[PDB]
Design a binder for this molecule. Structure first.
Ligand SMILES: N=C(N)c1ccc(C[C@H]2CCCC[C@H](Cc3ccc(C(=N)N)cc3)C2=O)cc1
Ligand SMILES: [Ca+2]
Length: 223
């Protein structure tokens, strides 16, 4: 997260850290047994870390649970990143409490202008490298497709939306991938891709979750 602020320990209880010996992607807890992340975060041997703030220090509220199954969207396209969404099932149900909770799925899509909260342990520099140990937060509005496309020249699909600031300075970044984009109390997006970080006219691109609710529900019910 570039240009954000420190969230505060466990103030974003649905945020998870995917770990393979180190943090490599974010994710969101949708119920006691499932996590949603980005398909481009796919990897074998994943451990899901819940209730985390500082990812380098055991503070007491963490829950470390291995993934039993990973399901990448059947139509994920690694060339365009269309359908960049993946589901992960935990080997054992997580214990839900005030510091570890699920985030609700959308009943309807969000509209341009809506304010959202993006969070992650990704790079905090637009130029250079600096990874934080504590969770970072950023409030960003969803941009109209027209404003996003005309300014960035990005190839976007109906399964994506941009959010951020065209003037640059505030944006998600590498390391934030798979993380949540919550607006009006619902999970409306997943950190998917972008060009560099916080660059002018290059806003972040996010997977449009409201388009996958049916798939998510059916998948978790059958697995
Ligand atoms: N044409 C495409 N769809 C496309 C273009 C570039 C990349 C590379 C890469 C680089 C590899 C790691 C994944 C990644 C992560 C990332 C996430 C958010 C942001 C941001 N909001 N500024 C930037 C980068 C990304 O977009 C992937 C896909
Ligand atoms: Ca910790």
């Amino acid at each position: 997260i570039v240009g954000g602020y420190t969230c505060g320990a466990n103030t974003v209880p649905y945020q998870v850290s995917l770990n393979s010996g180190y943090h490599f992607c974010g994710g969101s807890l949708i119920n006691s047994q499932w996590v949603v992340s980005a398909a481009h975060c796919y990897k074998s041997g994943i451990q899901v870390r819940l209730g985390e703030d500082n990812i380098n220090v055991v503070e007491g509220n963490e829950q470390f649970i291995s993934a039993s199954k990973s399901i990448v969207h059947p139509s994920y396209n690694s060339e365009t990143y269309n359908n960049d969404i993946m589901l992960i099932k935990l080997k054992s149900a997580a214990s839900l409490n005030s510091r570890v909770a699920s985030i609700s799925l959308p009943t309807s899509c969000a509209s341009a202008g809506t304010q959202c909260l993006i969070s992650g342990w990704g790079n905090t520099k637009s130029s250079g490298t600096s990874y934080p140990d504590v969770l970072k937060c950023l409030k960003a509005p969803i941009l109209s497709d027209s404003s996003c496309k005309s300014a960035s020249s990005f190839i976007i699909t109906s399964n994506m939306f941009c959010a951020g600031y065209l003037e640059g300075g505030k944006d998600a970044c590498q390391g934030d991938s798979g993380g949540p984009v919550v607006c009006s109390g619902k999970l409306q997006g997943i950190v998917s891709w972008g060009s560099g970080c916080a660059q002018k006219n290059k806003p972040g691109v996010y997977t449009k979750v409201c388009n996958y609710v049916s798939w998510i529900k059916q998948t978790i019910a059958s697995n």
